[model samples]
Target: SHMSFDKQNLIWIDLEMTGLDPEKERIIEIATIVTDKNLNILAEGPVLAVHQSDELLNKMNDWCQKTHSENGLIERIKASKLTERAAELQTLDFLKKWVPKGASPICGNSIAQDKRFLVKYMPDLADYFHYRHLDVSTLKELAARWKPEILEGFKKENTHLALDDIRESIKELAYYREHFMKLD
Candidate 1:
C-alpha cells in the first residue's frame, strides 16, 4: 500500500558528458548516490563510464578535451566496455533498489542540465525521478549575492568526474546549511 508521497529520499546524480550540448554530445561517465533528506548517504551507487567511439571523443569541445584528458577520464572512456544502454540499465536498477517507490527529487549542482541529458539518453532512469529538482548551485548563487563570506574559502575542486562532482555538491550544500541556513 505505498503511495507516491510516502518517502522523501533524494537521488543525487552527476554526469560527465563530451560537451554541454545534449543532442550532439553524450554522457561519458555517470554516478548516482541515494541519500536522505538530510544528505546522509544511503547508498553509494554505481560509477560507470559509457563506451564512446574515438570519433565521438575526438569531437569533444576544447574545454572538455583538456579537462577530461587531464583527469584521465578520456582514457577510461576509451577503455570502458560498458555500453550507454548497459550503463543506463545498471543505474536504473541501482536507483530502484535504493530509493523507495515514491518519487525522489534528483539532486545535484545545476542538475537541470543533467536532467536534460538523462531524459534524452536515459529516459527510463529519468522517469524514476520527480519533476522537482534540488539544485545546490541555486543556493551557491544566492549565498554569493547575499552572504559572500559564507563561501569565501570554500573552493570546489571541480573534478568533473561523476562521483567526485556529486560528493562536492553534497559538501557544498552541507556547508551552506551549517553557515547560512541556521534554524535555531
Candidate 2:
C-alpha cells in the first residue's frame, strides 16, 4: 500500500485523541489535507469519528469530555458520529484516492504521535504512504534553534484539529523549503 511522492504530492494529517496510550486511549477525531509543492491545497478531509457513535460520547467521563469539549470536538462528533471502523475505512478510501499506492510523504506537527494512532487503527491505509514522515514540530525546533527569524509569525502549538494543523504545517514546510532549505 505504499506510494511514491514528490514534494508536490504531500498529505498532511492530524488526530485528536482521548489519551496518549494507544492501547488504553482512543482516537476522537481525524483530519487530512493534500497539497502541492507550494502548499496549495488539493483536497481536504474533515475530522472523522473514532468513538463509534453518539452513544459513546455519553460514556466519556469528566476528563475525557472536558478535553474534547474544550476543543469544540464533542459537538462536531455528535453531528458526524460514526464508528471507529468507519472512520478508518473512510480515511483509507480518502488516502487511496489522493496518495496513490509507493511513498508519499506525510506532514504533521506531532507526526510520530499521530502516525501511531493511524497505524494502529488503519494499518493498511497507513502502509499506503512512505514510512518517512515530516514532523513540523521538529522543523519548528530547528528553526527556533538556528533560524529563529523564520518562526516570527508561526505559532508553535497545535490547535488539535487535523486540517488546521495541516495548513500551518504546510506553511512551515513551504517556508523552510523556500527560505531555509532552498529545496524549491
Candidate 3:
C-alpha cells in the first residue's frame, strides 16, 4: 500500500433539484468540474438532465416550477433520456477518470446540501468524494459579516442551473482569493 499524501485536486459538483429537502425532493440535473488546488479547469464533466415522470415534476414547488420553466430546464428534463441511475453512472465514470477514489474534496457553494441529496439518491457517486468539502458559501457569509469590503465588485448571476452555478462558485472563490487572500 503506497501512502501518498499529496492530493490537491477538487471535485466540484452542483445539482439542481426540484426542491430543497433532500428527503422529499429529487435531483433533476447534475454538473461536475474537476480542478486543481488553484482551481484551474482540469476537466469539465457531464451536464445531465435526468428524466422524470410528469407526476414527479408536478411535485415541484412553485419556485422550482417557475425557475426551471423559465430556464428551459423543464423542457430539457422532458427531452432527456437519462434516468437518475444512468446519470449517476455517467457522473461516476467521469469522476473516476479524473480523480482518485475518495481522495478529492468536493467544492461549491452550500455544497453540503447537494451532498445530502447525493447521499440519499446517488450513494455510489456520493461515496466517491472525500468526506470533507470546500464550501464557498461559508466564505461569503464570513466576508459579508466581518469583511464586506472584500466582496466589493463580486456578483453572481444566480442562474440556478447546475453548470453555471458551479462556474459561478469557482469564480467567486477566485475573486475572494485575488482580492483578499494574497500572499506577498
Candidate 4:
C-alpha cells in the first residue's frame, strides 16, 4: 500500500486504559488528537470516558491509583461507553463521524490492541483500525534502533497508557524513518 502521509487526512488517537488486558482492562479516559492532510489540527475531539465493568468500579489498583485518583473512582460501572450515555462524548462513535468521510487508517502504539478496542466498542469501526494500522511497536522492533537512556527505561513497561505511548510512537516513527527505514 502507501506509506503514511499518502492520505487525504490523518489521525493520532492515544488512549489510557485501566489495565492491559482488554477483557479485564477498562478505559478511564480517552483523548484523541486529530489532524488533517495538511497536518493542521483541524477540530479535535471531546475526551471520552468508558464506564468500567462492575469489577473495576468498586476497586482501585496501584496502577490505577498512580494515573488517576480514587476520588470519583466509581465501581459497578455500566458496561457501556461514554458515547452511549451522552452526546457530548460521542467522539468514540467513529462510525458516526471520523477524520475522513468513509475509511482511513489510524496510527497507534499498539495497533492490535487499539484496533481491537475500537472494534469491540463499535464493531463498524473495525475497518478503521484493522487493515490500515501503523503499529509503532512492530516498526520499532523491525528497526532495532537504539534509544535514549530515559526512554530505554520504560520500554519494558507494558501499562498500555494510550496517549503517553502515542507520543513515544511518534518519536519511534521519526527515529525509525530517519535511521532505519526509507520510504520507497
Q: Which of the numbered candidates is closest to the native, going by highest lDDT?
A: 3
Of the pair 2 and 4, which is ahead by lDDT? 2
Tens digits of per-residue lDDT, candidate 3, 1-184, equal: 1122136678899998888888888888999988877888777889999877888799888888998999889899999999888999999988877778799877899899999999999999999988988999888898898889877789889775677788899999998888767567
How high is each candidate's TM-score?
A: 0.91, 0.79, 0.91, 0.61
Residues 8-114 of candidate 1: C-alpha lDDT, one tens digit per residue: 77899998888888999899998998877788877778899888889889898788899898988878898999987899989887777667643788799999999
lDDT of 2 by residue, 46-81 (tens): 567565455556556678788788877877776765
lDDT of 4 by residue, 43-87 (tens): 455555566655664465676655554333332124344552352
TM-score, cand. 4 vs. native: 0.61
Runs in model 1 deviating more than 4 A are: 1-6
Misplaced by over 4 Å in model 2 are: 1-8, 52-67, 78-80, 156-161
Order of candidates by lDDT, top first?
Answer: 3, 1, 2, 4
